[PDB]
Amino acid sequence: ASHLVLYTGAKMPILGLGTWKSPPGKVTEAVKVAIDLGYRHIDCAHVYQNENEVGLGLQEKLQGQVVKREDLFIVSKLWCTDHEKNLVKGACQTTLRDLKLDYLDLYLIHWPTGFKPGKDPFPLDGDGNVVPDESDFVETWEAMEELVDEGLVKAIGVSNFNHLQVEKILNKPGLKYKPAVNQIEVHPYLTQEKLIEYCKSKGIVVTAYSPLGSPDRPWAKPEDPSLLEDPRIKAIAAKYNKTTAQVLIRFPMQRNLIVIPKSVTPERIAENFQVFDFELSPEDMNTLLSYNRNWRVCALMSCASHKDYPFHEEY
Numbered sequence: 001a002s003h004l005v006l007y008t009g010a011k012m013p014i015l016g017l018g019t020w021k022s023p024p025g026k027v028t029e030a031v032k033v034a035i036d037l038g039y040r041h042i043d044c045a046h047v048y049q050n051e052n053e054v055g056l057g058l059q060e061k062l063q064g065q066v067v068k069r070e071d072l073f074i075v076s077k078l079w080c081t082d083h084e085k086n087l088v089k090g091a092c093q094t095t096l097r098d099l100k101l102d103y104l105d106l107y108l109i110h111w112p113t114g115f116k117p118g119k120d121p122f123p124l125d126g127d128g129n130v131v132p133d134e135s136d137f138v139e140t141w142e143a144m145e146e147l148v149d150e151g152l153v154k155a156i157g158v159s160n161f162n163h164l165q166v167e168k169i170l171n172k173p174g175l176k177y178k179p180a181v182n183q184i185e186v187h188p189y190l191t192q193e194k195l196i197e198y199c200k201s202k203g204i205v206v207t208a209y210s211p212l213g214s215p216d217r218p219w220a221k222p223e224d225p226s227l228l229e230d231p232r233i234k235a236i237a238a239k240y241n242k243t244t245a246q247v248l249i250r251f252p253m254q255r256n257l258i259v260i261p262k263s264v265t266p267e268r269i270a271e272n273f274q275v276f277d278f279e280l281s282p283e284d285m286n287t288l289l290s291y292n293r294n295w296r297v298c299a300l301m302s303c304a305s306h307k308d309y310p311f312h313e314e315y
């Protein structure tokens with residue numbers, strides 16, 4: 001479509017640049033190059049440790065009159081150690097200052113899981129699992145609502161919430177704003193049609209993260225399945241005279257999901273924008289959907305015992 005529309009009215013660009021694992025000394029040029037290629041949406045997060053450097057690229061493009069702030073759709077996320085209601089405004093302000101922006105277009109609760117506050121991002125105990133705080137994400141949701149009320153963010157949403165977690169927000173007494181977006185892992189090996197269908201029935205947009213399976217994820221050990229080099233999808237690419245990457249990016253788009261592929265490589269940032277020039281015929285769509293192995297790349301195993309760990313539920 002080019003954009004999907006959130007329930008607030010705001011047009012959210014269907015393709016965005018992902019910045020997880022984009023190193024601080026590469027992400028400014030990547031952001032700059034992307035905006036030069038026409039990307040108008042950047043997905044960021046406090047925990048990626050490069051929002052300052054994202055802010056540099058953006059500032060350059062905005063002072064250089066290459067883009068108007070209204071044309072940009074910048075997303076960031078509230079980290080797990082900042083879920084306590086009193087910590088939320090502070091975390092949104094750090095992110096705003098680092099990004100050098102006055103408001104965010106979308107701010108997401110990054111994971112349902114609140115971790116014990118402190119500077120350490122993943123506070124681990126002696127057994128090695130993560131330490132929980134004393135908060136419920138419904139209380140965090142309320143402080144996220146105050147950010148809308150003050151004009152710090154134009155829309156709020158969640159990420160990696162299962163449908164019962166989304167339900168607990170939707171059914172909250174006093175709910176002022178509902179999640180405009182649920183950003184979740186989606187790719188052939190985790191097609192997520194139940195959660196997607198659910199959010200779509202509730203009028204929540206879906207952003208598919210890790211559209212290519214994340215080759216650069218630290219935990220990639222040699223025996224892993226590589227979506228990009230899986231001969232089956234490379235074959236349907238060959239037919240399309242498109243790459244495995246461009247077709248794995250076209251797939252969520254054809255499902256009416258926002259896609260945010262990550263690349264710091266200029267050439268691949270341009271290739272990933274070169275997806276608006278074709279359609280996959282319905283057999284192809286069915287051929288990729290049938291690869292649902294329910295293979296998660298972002299499982300957060302360290303937090304599997306957490307009361308709000310999202311993935312013990314089916315969807």
Ligand SMILES: NC(=O)c1ccc[n+]([C@@H]2O[C@H](COP(=O)([O-])OP(=O)(O)OC[C@H]3O[C@@H](n4cnc5c(N)ncnc54)[C@H](OP(=O)(O)O)[C@@H]3O)[C@@H](O)[C@H]2O)c1
Binds near residue numbers: 211215246263
């Ligand atoms: N909410 C959440 O919990 C959450 C979790 C994970 C990810 N996300 C978001 O989703 C974004 C994308 O997911 P991801 O970074 O995990 O992985 P991804 O987009 O599936 O894959 C990124 C990897 O694939 C490579 N790649 C990108 N374009 C390519 C192309 N055109 N051809 C060949 N290889 C290509 C990248 O290499 P180079 O970068 O070296 O080019 C990088 O190694 C993240 O950056 C982040 O913003 C959100």
